[PDB]
Chain length 260, copies 4
């Protein structure tokens, strides 16, 4: 069966990692998918490969902090596919430092990409969704939106913020056939994380295996990275017509991290 | 596709309402389902109808407060189907009173059915699941496990308690291929609730429609009862092989109740 | 100054540990204190020493699971001091086991002492407090009321439950000048805990110091036991006329345990 | 007794409302208080009146979004009083609009004042506090940091964010004698709120009394505004040497709003 059959899905940061898998898996479920990221070359390359596999894919690159460019990617989507049924605000990045050595500019940029970016997306899709009395907004948050972690002042601040935006947005459209949720993964096996494992391995003079098993997974009860496939599967449920009563939630898939 | 293909699902309180729909929908997803409740007559009638529709159904009635009878229903399941892959602790009931007029016996019985009952189920399935390094335990909790509501001393106490049991159980089996989650519905269109709408309509001398729209749905942003179909659909996801990284969570489907 | 000047404080489990310090410190703040516990000999000894220090102390021993004896301790308080302004539900105990080896009787008893006990206390003081349009109820919960911990099925279930009872009770008396809060300590330097340090030291063949510093404080950011003095100081604030707008809260003092 | 005796308290937004009361009440508890706000004239006027009442008060005006001016107010404090023991990040404002009509600039400014402002304060006091192995940081958040409210996209996003910053900061200094908490008031009787009552009274053609009792207090179980005195009293406890084991918490004083 095709759980997202001829729905139109716009996914920010979809040229790598969780967003790329979400785009791929949404297409397999019958979605028309919009590949959007900074790297406009990976975006065409991505959408072009999905088209060769017989999928409906549009390249609509944009910096989510650039409201003019984000608004025009949304208009190109409307022009191309007729609507936006599903928005995934996934674009993000990381900077780990103690607060004293945390550049204020970088704090502000993490917040601008991962909070203000989601707010821009939502502001511009809410009209399209309210008109059709249907939609699904998923803000890719993190357990770091629900707990503290030393060195992640900007990230945890931005992810905490996007859960607040999620609840406010959910209340504003609860009557309009529209859900607004924050999907909160724990550690996922992504380019992002294998880099951070490499990072920790160099600096602590340990093997990639120890770096992963003794540091990163130290506080994960299941002692494993989640697969992008697992995040994508939860995204499909939340993005589907079957999840219309789920709204204003921080939805957690963290191998038990936050249960302790 | 059949998301629960030849999994064995044991569901407490499955002769009516959410448990009956879960049993029906789990069967459509290829589960072998065990109908278990107080009313042993409805249990045979239920399982007999599922068998006539070409489903694999066992009647294993028991009072979940009766640990001998619960343990024997689990053994009859093992004998019949070879294992238990999925436990749904769904059995429950309600008594609304101000604390001063809340009989202590009734407080204790709500807790015994809806907390101690879940603990008995889990204690007896954990061996079977740990041996096979696979399982799914879903404790049917409520938003009343996450918030207060005047008049529900025993219910809210028991539902809060089963979320605590959920987290403890999740941590004890996180390495064993086993997930333990609490599904937290808001108001569902059930025999239970249509009765409580009738109740409120008599006592306040209003129509069933006002009783529903002005009292019960007063604090539901979506202003609607959830369908048993919606709870069942979330239960299928959480009970499926696709949700192996979801554990120790209060998973909320409440039309936005708890977002405000 | 005397923050509890001629208030009447009834404290369950007040013959040792946190309850004994609360009784002592409440007396220093001008409270009339009721010492209540299982050990009726320690209760007279306690109250007799407070009297010799020029304090107003009553011995009213009772098992909090014995509703007849709890109701009569409350009546003896009314007879002796004229009212109950402050109830501290502190009585408790611990049994750590994996769920499979967790006797159901012991699960039920942890819940009966630490949930049903608090409900009995509240049921019997709510009339006295509602009549006078004043009161303070503090349920001694734990971080284990807010998170999971492996081996604590009964404890975490009971503490989770008493936070639910707290919210329900708070909503029932929010107009009556009455607050209902759950004080949630982390690890406190108590007879209870020094025993559990001794326990862990024997079984793991390590020093008391390693047992404390490497096991118990492993997940405490501040890397220290809290003093009974610290819990008592928060109890005084919450029990004082200054905290009338604090109600229905899990109030956490855990050296940062739950922030991660 | 003087609970803050010769502690040095720097309070942002302290020329009106909660910050002004905190400054006044901290002075009565023996603090040396720094009055800091946009209005540099109210700041001198404030500090000058505290000096005439025999208090230790410094006027150090600054825009908390201006990191150069905030850093220099902190240096003037060090020069004047020798240290900073207590930081209250209180500066804030409100803009209520549906997301579609919510100017992105205004979203960004609410976040810059109430999140980035707190991060600037913390970055610059953490060195002073870590050197002396003592401090207290209180971020004035709101229940709107813990729940959703329609029309408050920027506010709820910023307040949610500052709770995240609170937990991260708490973990970074848990060993250094420093606590970081977010005080979360409900509706307080402030210039801010009496304005919003006037606002609602005009627009809905109702009396100030109905506007307050039927709209604002609709979801407050205690059906009353909190006094600035009540927030100040909790701030004193959290800012005192008695609260050293409280850290990384959203500390709620909301007349029961969030318990339902
Ligand atoms: N990987 C994990 O373990 C993990 C855990 C929790 C949550 N998350 C969150 O999930 C999301 C996906 O992360 P990921 O691990 O797939 O990797 P990633 O962050 O490398 O991928 C995100 C994509 O966002 C793009 N991007 C960055 N800034 C952008 C901007 N301003 N505008 C447009 N695109 C921009 C990047 O180019 C990248 O391709 C992020 O929001 C992340 O914070 C990740
Ligand atoms: N209906 C709602 O709106 C709602 C909302 C939140 C959560 N819930 C929870 O979901 C579950 C299902 O409730 P429901 O609305 O389908 O109706 P229900 O409570 O009428 O059905 C539950 C079943 O449990 C059975 N049962 C009761 N005590 C039992 C015992 N000791 N042993 C065995 N079986 C027993 C009953 O006979 C009944 O058939 C309950 O746990 C309820 O608390 C319901
Ligand atoms: N010590 C800690 O680190 C810690 C941490 C979190 C919360 N708590 C909670 O704080 C409370 C105080 O614990 P504590 O460490 O002071 O020690 P404790 O549990 O040894 O003291 C509690 C007292 O309760 C009494 N008691 C037990 N069962 C009773 C019953 N049925 N009726 C009456 N009295 C009974 C005991 O005799 C004892 O004197 C408990 O509720 C505990 O669960 C303790
Ligand atoms: N009043 C309530 O009911 C309530 C409820 C929850 C939380 N809060 C929070 O408590 C705090 C105090 O609010 P309040 O009601 O006393 O009123 P307020 O917001 O009017 O007072 C805050 C002060 O901050 C100052 N300020 C604003 N922007 C500034 C900037 N960039 N730099 C420096 N100073 C600046 C203002 O001039 C003002 O004097 C705020 O953070 C508010 O969000 C208030």
């Amino acid at each position: 069966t095709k759980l997202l059959d001829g729905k139109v899905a716009f996914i920010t940061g979809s040229a790598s990692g969780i967003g790329l898998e979400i785009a791929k898996k949404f297409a397999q479920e019958g979605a028309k998918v919009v590949i959007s990221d900074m790297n406009a070359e990976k975006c065409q390359e991505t959408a072009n490969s999905l088209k060769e596999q017989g999928f409906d894919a549009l390249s609509a690159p944009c910096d989510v902090t650039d409201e003019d460019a984000y608004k025009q990617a949304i208009e190109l989507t409307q022009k191309t596919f007729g609507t936006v049924d599903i928005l995934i605000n996934n674009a993000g990045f990381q900077h780990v430092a103690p607060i004293e050595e945390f550049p204020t500019a970088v704090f502000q940029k993490l917040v601008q990409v991962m909070l203000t970016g989601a707010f821009i997306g939502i502001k511009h899709v809410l009209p399209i969704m309210k008109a059709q009395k249907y939609g699904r907004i998923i803000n890719m948050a993190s357990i770091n939106g629900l707990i503290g972690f030393a060195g992640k002042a900007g990230y945890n601040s931005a992810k905490h913020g996007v859960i607040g935006l999620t609840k406010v947005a959910a209340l504003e459209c609860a009557r309009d056939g529209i859900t607004v949720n924050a999907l909160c993964p724990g550690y996922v096996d992504t380019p992002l994380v294998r880099g951070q494992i490499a990072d920790l391995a160099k600096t602590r003079n340990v093997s990639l295996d120890s770096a992963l098993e003794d540091v990163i997974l130290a506080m994960v009860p299941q002692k494993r990275l989640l697969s992008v496939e697992e995040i994508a599967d939860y995204a499909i449920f939340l993005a589907s017509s079957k999840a219309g009563g789920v709204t204003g939630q921080a939805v957690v898939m963290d191998g038990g991290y936050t249960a302790q």
